Structure 1
Amino acid sequence: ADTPPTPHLDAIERSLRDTSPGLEGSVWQRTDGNRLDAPDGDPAGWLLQTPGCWGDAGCKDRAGTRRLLDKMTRNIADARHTVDISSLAPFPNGGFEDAVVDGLKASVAAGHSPRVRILVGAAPIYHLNVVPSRYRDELIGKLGAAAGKVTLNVASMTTSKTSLSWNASKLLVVDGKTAITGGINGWKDDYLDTAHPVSDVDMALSGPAARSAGKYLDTLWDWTCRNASDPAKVWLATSNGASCMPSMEQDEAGSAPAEPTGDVPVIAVGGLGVGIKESDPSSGYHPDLPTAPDTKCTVGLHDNTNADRDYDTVNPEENALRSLIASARSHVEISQQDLNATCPPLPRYDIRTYDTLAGKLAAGVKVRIVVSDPANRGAVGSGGYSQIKSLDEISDTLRTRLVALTGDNEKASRALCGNLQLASFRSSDAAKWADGKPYALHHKLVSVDDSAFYIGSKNLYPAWLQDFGYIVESPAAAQQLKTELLDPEWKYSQQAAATPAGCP
């Protein structure tokens, strides 16, 4: 009870408990006594950005990549009992795969027999080559004589075909004690073996919040083990005759409390997407849902982001992001692939998130939004690393939401023009990577007041997936985030700032 207050964490916790009280302890959880997992002589080494090659359009010194991969390997090498991987399909390949294999063999060479889960979400059409039994067989071959001691459960899953829901959480949890999470998929060709690497960020922690994340994953595997009765939803491959492990993380927690490793207070928050759980039946959540039609796109699907109270209650991650932004009293940095979705089949944007940002702009709070360059766009379903044709799609929508709010277009411009910084992502002085390709950005990052930040898998654009991430409140940690990532991103991305329509 010497601890500093957590104004931002307190406001997010309120929201989550109003929206989803019944999911506390499974799909969301606040904890004290976490540690941001950094090695010696590398104090911001808990922040796992890739490629981490600022100021060089040839990206020759990929210090972020190196650290990301050394930390995956080493977390796995330290396993006594359990390894729990979630990702977006394909299953991890190249160096992401080697981290897991080198890590498991090390654990076996230390004398352990680890249980391993690997879970991917699969979109109903690109799958993919995506095959659990082939992937498991590949790991078994790569694992050598170690395979005998490693218990694998390998699954690919789609929770709803019609509502476009599957796992996209990106988690590596070891012994319910350490967790690495964020936006990074195990896709070597996009992240590693390319001269135009995707820019992304994970974070690494240890502590009670690592257990919060395993609890989330047992939630996913309960559904997944049960729904292997339906091969249209789940493909599953186990090794060594082993049963499905719905309960791996509870089994490893057993009956003792998670011990603190540090002093960082953390909120873990995910969502159940569509087709796992209908609602939190214990929730009293009764919002006034938004109403503003979009002039560009009228979504055909039932709109779960903007017009479905039950979905909110099983997807606390949406409101956790909105209330993180709403808690900003001085400034917010948004670093995202996208704020707008591909409409149809999804709503183009989250009305409330956009309302939340327009409120901030009106109130004189500084809003910074950096997104992946529009030049990255496909290909309606590719899905390339942009879902807009120009940054005006974000500022025009801000304008539209500023007009709803205030009544006049001239007040709108003072708040938009005065308080918004909007740009495509760059990491050096050059407009694109040295090989000609544009920089692809895939962060799911929010920072508020250099005090509290989200790093996880949940995008700010509309998506109805199983996602997960962490919210940290710590001035020290957010100072490291500012210095190592956000300042540098603004340094180089300000070159590609948008002046909105209606501004000088």
Structure 2
Amino acid sequence: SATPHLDAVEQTLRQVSPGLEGDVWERTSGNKLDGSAADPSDWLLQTPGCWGDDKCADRVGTKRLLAKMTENIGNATRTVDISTLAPFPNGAFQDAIVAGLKESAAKGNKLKVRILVGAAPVIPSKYRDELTAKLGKAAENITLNVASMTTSKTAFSWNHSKILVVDGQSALTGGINSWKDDYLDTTHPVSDVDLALTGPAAGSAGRYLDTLWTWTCQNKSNIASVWFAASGNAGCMPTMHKDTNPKASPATGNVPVIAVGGLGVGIKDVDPKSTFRPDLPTASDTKCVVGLHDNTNADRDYDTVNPEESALRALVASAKGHIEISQQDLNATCPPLPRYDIRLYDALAAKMAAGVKVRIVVSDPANRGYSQIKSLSEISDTLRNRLANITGGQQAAKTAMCSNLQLATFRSSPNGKWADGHPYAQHHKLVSVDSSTFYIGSKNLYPSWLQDFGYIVESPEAAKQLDAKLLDPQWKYSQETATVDYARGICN
């Protein structure tokens, strides 16, 4: 097959979540990574994109990101569909949205617009008011829905997807929250990444958002769950995508993609169609406390409504040569979450035991919002212990790990911190295998029970661009913090 990695992932998803095919995950063909003529790699919306410079003077990444947001929205003829994590977009992110909506209104278009945020237990109506003011006459051309939602207080579940879909044709998604203080107006900007695509896979994102809004509209009169605000006399639009855009979006290229998300906890308890029967591993030191219910490692039904967890573990399992992972963290803060995904660490171990190389780069613990560990030893110890189960003991586990792992914290310049003294924070949710197939999205690899979304893209050309523009510069500067690095025999 031309697509061995997606074939494997697709087969797993159809066993895990068959009833959610089309809506929460979907394989499509005919897509395009949406870069410019001049710089074809700039579908890769990294921020800040100021490699080598501890002062971050020339933020080519940030400029392109904000410009691409405006360009895509300004091309809307029917719908704009945005999700993110609260707070609502501010600063130049909000400016970009407003600018795009004004551009589309002046080209003559009448638009339906939804903006959904996930929130912890006045904000939505205030945001609607601010946007309506900033739009001026353009607001006459726009039917707006704005909502903040929480699906489970007890499971800490709410939207965390970060999606911008226009006309079901174009989609931007990834790890970037629309937060001016963390990303923009700061001399220690967070390092993150979104991708831009067009084609049928943008339709998949539209159907995911209909899934979320269908729940949101149903629960709009439950004030523990949902705060909703609309323009004028407009009702809630649970199915704007299905009602307004073509069931299959037009084709734009030749790129195969798997869209995959999850429903967290509190929208749907199980996929009734699923006959998935997982062999669940044995835990030990993930569930720091006894009373906690562990959806990541010990809840089959949870898997069936959260195909993305399985998808990421299958993507790892598909690698023949090498895997690069760039995350904020691999481990979560316990309680209330378990420390780590046992199956993920087992899949990485299985790979290293077979001589497939694994790179993990995470955020500097000196950040501990943007870190949940004290030391990289909390990742290497865990990997070693899981390797021990399949190499016959601790010595043979350490050897396999030191021969096949690169483990480090992130830097983007020769300096150990930003010039302003603040550590580098990284927030990517990125996995690439084989210079071939990659995930960019909102789903962290650390235990999390949220609604998330991303794309798995199989395109060697695109993956090489990802190497050149992000992973290679990343390892160039980050490798100086490595505790394990097989390529230089480092083994601490």
Q: Shared fold by TM > 0.5?
A: yes
Aligned to 1:311: 302
The amino acid that maps onto 2:78 is: H
In the alignment, is the contact (CA less than 8 A) between 2:145 and 2:228 conserved in 1? Answer: yes
Alignment partner of 1:390 out of 369, 375, 380:
375
In the alignment, is the contact (CA less than 8 A) between 1:215 and 1:249 conserved in 2? Answer: yes
Which whole-Å deviations, capped at 9, do the CAs of 1:268-311 have from their partners, x for residues lacking one? 00000000001110011001112221078236421000000000
In structure 2, do the counterparts of structure 1 residues 487 and 243 end up closer, same or farther at CA, with 3 Å as the change threshold? same
Across the two proteins, how many residue pairs are aligned to each other? Answer: 488
Aligned to 1:428: 413
The 5 A counterparts of 1:240-389 are: 240-254=232-246, 257-294=248-285, 297-298=288-289, 300-377=291-368, 384-389=369-374
Report the Cα distance in structure 1 between the residues aligned to 2:33 and 2:363, rounded to whole angstroms: 27
Alignment partner of 2:400 out of 415, 422, 436:
415
* SS at 1:485 equivalent: helix
In structure 2, do the counterparts of structure 1 residues 24 and 104 end up closer, same or farther at CA, with 3 Å as the change threshold? same
Aligned to 2:206: 214
Report the Cα distance in structure 1 between the residues aligned to 2:108 and 2:243, rounded to whole angstroms: 20
Aligned to 2:433: 448
Alignment partner of 1:203 out of 195, 210, 215:
195
Measured after TM superposition, the shift of residue 347 of structure 1 is 0.2
Report the Cα distance in structure 1 between the residues aligned to 2:424 and 2:410, rounded to whole angstroms: 7
In the alignment, is the contact (CA less than 8 A) between 1:299 and 1:345 conserved in 2? Answer: no
* SS at 2:220 equivalent: helix
* SS at 2:210 equivalent: helix
Aligned to 2:442: 457
Report the Cα distance in structure 2 between the residues aligned to 1:462 and 1:252, rounded to whole angstroms: 36
Report the Cα distance in structure 1 between the residues aligned to 2:60 and 2:291, rounded to whole angstroms: 45
Question: TM-score, normalised to structure 1's length?
Answer: 0.95
The amino acid that maps onto 1:116 is: V
Gaps of 5+ in 1: 125-129, 378-383
Alignment partner of 1:490 out of 472, 475, 483:
475
The amino acid that maps onto 2:177 is: N
> Is residue 2:177 matched to residue 1:180?
no
Report the Cα distance in structure 2 between the residues aligned to 1:341 and 1:84, rounded to whole angstroms: 30
Measured after TM superposition, the shift of residue 405 of structure 1 is 2.3
Alignment partner of 1:18 out of 9, 15, 19:
15
Report the Cα distance in structure 1 between the residues aligned to 2:203 and 2:424, rounded to whole angstroms: 35
The amino acid that maps onto 2:61 is: G
In the alignment, is the contact (CA less than 8 A) between 1:299 and 1:347 conserved in 2? Answer: no
Measured after TM superposition, the shift of residue 426 of structure 1 is 0.2
Measured after TM superposition, the shift of residue 408 of structure 1 is 1.2
In structure 2, do the counterparts of structure 1 residues 366 and 247 end up closer, same or farther at CA, with 3 Å as the change threshold? same
The amino acid that maps onto 2:10 is: E
Aligned to 2:222: 230
Measured after TM superposition, the shift of residue 326 of structure 1 is 0.6
Report the Cα distance in structure 1 between the residues aligned to 2:85 and 2:322, rounded to whole angstroms: 32
Aligned to 2:451: 466
Report the Cα distance in structure 2 between the residues aligned to 1:314 and 1:156, rounded to whole angstroms: 21
Report the Cα distance in structure 1 between the residues aligned to 2:291 and 2:139, rounded to whole angstroms: 48
The amino acid that maps onto 2:15 is: D
Report the Cα distance in structure 2 between the residues aligned to 1:361 and 1:61, rounded to whole angstroms: 38
Report the Cα distance in structure 2 between the residues aligned to 1:295 and 1:357, rounded to whole angstroms: 16
Aligned to 1:66: 63
Measured after TM superposition, the shift of residue 258 of structure 1 is 2.0
The amino acid that maps onto 2:136 is: G
Which whole-Å deviations, capped at 9, do the CAs of 1:17-67 have from their partners, x for residues lacking one? 000000000000000000000112010010000000000000000000000
Aligned to 2:384: 399
Which whole-Å deviations, capped at 9, do the CAs of 1:378-400 have from their partners, x for residues lacking one? xxxxxx10000010000000011
* SS at 1:216 equivalent: helix
Report the Cα distance in structure 2 between the residues aligned to 1:123 and 1:36, rounded to whole angstroms: 34
Aligned to 1:480: 465
Report the Cα distance in structure 1 between the residues aligned to 2:183 and 2:436, rounded to whole angstroms: 29
* SS at 1:61 equivalent: coil
Which whole-Å deviations, capped at 9, do the CAs of 1:69-102 have from their partners, x for residues lacking one? 0000000000001000000000010011011100
Report the Cα distance in structure 2 between the residues aligned to 1:296 and 1:418, rounded to whole angstroms: 29
Report the Cα distance in structure 1 between the residues aligned to 2:396 and 2:34, rounded to whole angstroms: 45
In the alignment, is the contact (CA less than 8 A) between 2:408 and 2:484 conserved in 1? Answer: no
Report the Cα distance in structure 1 between the residues aligned to 2:392 and 2:400, rounded to whole angstroms: 13
Report the Cα distance in structure 2 between the residues aligned to 1:470 and 1:202, rounded to whole angstroms: 10
Measured after TM superposition, the shift of residue 498 of structure 1 is 1.1
* SS at 2:207 equivalent: helix
Aligned to 2:77: 80
Measured after TM superposition, the shift of residue 254 of structure 1 is 4.4
Report the Cα distance in structure 2 between the residues aligned to 1:170 and 1:340, rounded to whole angstroms: 21
